[PDB]
Amino acid sequence: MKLSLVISTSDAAFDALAFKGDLRKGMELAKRVGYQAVEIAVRDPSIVDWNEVKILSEELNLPICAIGTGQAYLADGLSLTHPNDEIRKKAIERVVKHTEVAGMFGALVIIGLVRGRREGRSYEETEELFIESMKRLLELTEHAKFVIEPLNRYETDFINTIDDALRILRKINSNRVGILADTFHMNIEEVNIPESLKRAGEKLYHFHVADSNRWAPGCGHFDFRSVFNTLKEIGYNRYVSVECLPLPGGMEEAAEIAFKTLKELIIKL
Ligand SMILES: [Mn+2]
Hints:
Pathway: Polyol metabolism; myo-inositol metabolism
Active site: 149 (proton donor/acceptor), 243 (proton donor/acceptor)
Protein name: 5-keto-L-gluconate epimerase
CATH architecture: Alpha-Beta Barrel
Distance between the termini: 10 Å
Order of helices and strands: EHEHEHHEHEHEHHEHEH
GO biological process, one term: inositol metabolic process
Shape: globular
Largest sheet: 8 strands, parallel, barrel
Radius of gyration: 18 Å
Cofactor: Mn(2+); Mg(2+); Ni(2+)
Bound molecules: manganese (II) ion
């Protein structure tokens, strides 16, 4: 297993210099603390100079392991299940742009809130629309790999558990789509987290960690020990990525606390 840090970046349209500064600050922090990769989240990649990002990654020897897309929903209203087919098409087109960036870095593309909500419809219809959008994304991309992140009930009513996602993966039937499990969301939605991760098995492609309060791992009451025993049992050997509030004590202190907690769990496997 490898350790990665999610870094928050200002949106480049709403402040170009701030995006670049946030990115460099966070990557330098990740490197200093000892993380092996970073993870980012961008709303619209069209407005970022990714050649410059690649140079920074090369300078610091820090790959970008995953790219989040949720701001395309929260800020721009784009959803892969939107009842308006015009918006569904625009959401597919936006995510294609994320895959173009991801291909420069070998990064996973995260399907979180960009999948959209039920919006008063049946789960069945929402799921069918989503599967159609994912199949279109697979037809549109030759190399992109996607991970579906189950999210808690307050963020969405569509895909709340690992099982919800596994059912969808069986219908999509592509090894280019897997699961991103997140301990903060699982702490609410999963009955037995070790059992849920065993069911995921080889389909677990990426992993987000934060404590029960979404603070740095170690600063709540989530049982990471049982989780890491299960990750070893299933042979998980990809990224464990810290996605936590900058607490306690700010972004640097949280990243350091998280790293120390996770390193001790990993080294004792
Ligand atoms: Mn997450």
